[PDB]
A paper describes a structure:
In the early stage of eukaryotic DNA replication, the template DNA is unwound by the MCM helicase, which is activated by forming a complex with the Cdc45 and [name] proteins. On the other hand, the archaeal [name] appears to be either a tetramer formed by two types of subunits in a 2:2 ratio (α2β2) or a homotetramer of a single subunit (α4). The [name] complex from Pyrococcus furiosus increases the cognate MCM helicase activity, in a similar manner to eukaryotic [name], in spite of the lack of a eukaryotic Cdc45 homolog. In this paper, we report the crystal structure of the α2β2 [name] tetramer from Thermococcus kodakaraensis (TkoGINS), which consists of the [name] and [name] subunits.
Residue numbers in the entry:
A (entry chain A): 1 to 113, 129 to 186
B (entry chain B): -6 to 93, 101 to 131, 134 to 164
The structure:
Amino acid sequence: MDIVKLRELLEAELSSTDLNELDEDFYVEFDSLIKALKLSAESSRERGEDVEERLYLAQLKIAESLMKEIIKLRLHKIVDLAVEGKIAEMTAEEKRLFNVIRAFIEREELPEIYRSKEVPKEAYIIQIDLPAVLGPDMKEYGPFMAGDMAIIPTVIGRALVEREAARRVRI
Amino acid sequence: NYFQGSHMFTGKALIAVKVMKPFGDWKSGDIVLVEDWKARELWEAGVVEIVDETDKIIGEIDKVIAEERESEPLTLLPEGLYERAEFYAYYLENYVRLNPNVKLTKLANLRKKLRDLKLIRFNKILKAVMLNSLELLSRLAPEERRIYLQMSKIRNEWLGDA
């Protein structure tokens, strides 16, 4: 990981409204680059290279800056996914967060740092463009775009399946 | 006390710099191309000197501005035009504070020209939203791409039109 890669991923986050699919270790590798840029910088200040140091520091600020812009674009896309009930591949840290946004929306419990009503929902691939559908909970799902992965109540997903408009998936 | 960062160079543009001292494998007097951010850092510490490409840059924008005001579609911007204009603006800017005036007039022109170019293309994006489309993205700088994508999402959810 380096600033060149972060420059590419920022360009790619900006160029689509969809969450850019990243290497699972994106965040872990970012931290490394920064721990590595942090040691390399001390290891030059003391060693009296005002130049070699100035460069290690300037790269680090660029890294923090690129990251800031990338995470901002991604969080907003994640918020939209959590609100619209859609799915997309995202790092492990992002699923944790996505789960907290998702918890918040269905009024669950966000931590500090018939036999039951409960509407059963599963993941599906929407095959055609579909307008918002009304679930048994009176909550509406959609609209959806062909190609979207969504978590909707099985009662509706089932109807869409037998209708050739959706297909179950593995989230 | 407080260092006000200002515009930040991330390396999107390559700047021609003249080496003053033995840094790395570079000898002295020779001309090299570095990333804009590395250009400002080594310049600040007298390791290199900025090859004044303001002449070529100003006239470069003028050509693009001229092309826009001629045929409706948005045009492909030379690689890094925006970022390279920013750098010579930083160069002209901090040149008045060089280390031991015809320039401080050009600084104003480049700024007026860059501003002008972004507005003409912005205004064309606004109107393009009123008629998404992949083709157009392959013609916009990544930041303008973001804008077009956002404009259209707002527009489609309001109007719902084609």
